[PDB]
Symmetry: C3
Subunit: 68 residues, 3 copies
């Protein structure tokens, strides 16, 4: 308790920022499709996708270890 | 101390990322106003606004519990 | 251990979000250069640069204190 609840809202804060991040990335995508980019950016998505997965996996860790 | 100071710069890091997030969201807004979108995106702002508030509230939690 | 490993993946999660943030900021830059903005935004970069440094420094703190 206490110290551990501190890590409670810490993860919650980060989980929420992830959503604001995805919403942000999403906002960027559409701004790039309007312009007219049939590619030549697909490797930029490859990077955010790999960091999103790496992040979502790390959040899983935290949720399971915050069980004990 | 120690463990608790670790949670010190942890929150600080997240509070700073929030600003970089708002700066990011803000950078996206203007790019959407230039184009000419008199709406049809207002529900996307509704989502970031609700996550920004949820986040700002969670940071408050951390600041008060980091008092004891 | 335990509590401390919890702060392990916590920092890792934040370090990863920083990259997704830089990737996000970067995605915004190009969308602003295409349009044609030879300035009048350089003080917006001044803000993200100063928060990126402030953040990268805070992460350093965490990495060194997570040594003891």
């Amino acid at each position: 308790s206490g110290i551990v609840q501190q890590q409670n809202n810490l993860l919650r804060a980060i989980e929420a920022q992830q959503h604001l991040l995805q919403l942000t990335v999403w906002g960027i995508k559409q701004l790039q499709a309007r312009s007219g980019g049939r590619g030549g950016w697909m490797e930029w998505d490859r990077e955010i996708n790999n960091y999103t997965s790496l992040i979502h996996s790390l959040i899983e860790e935290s949720q399971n270890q915050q069980e004990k």
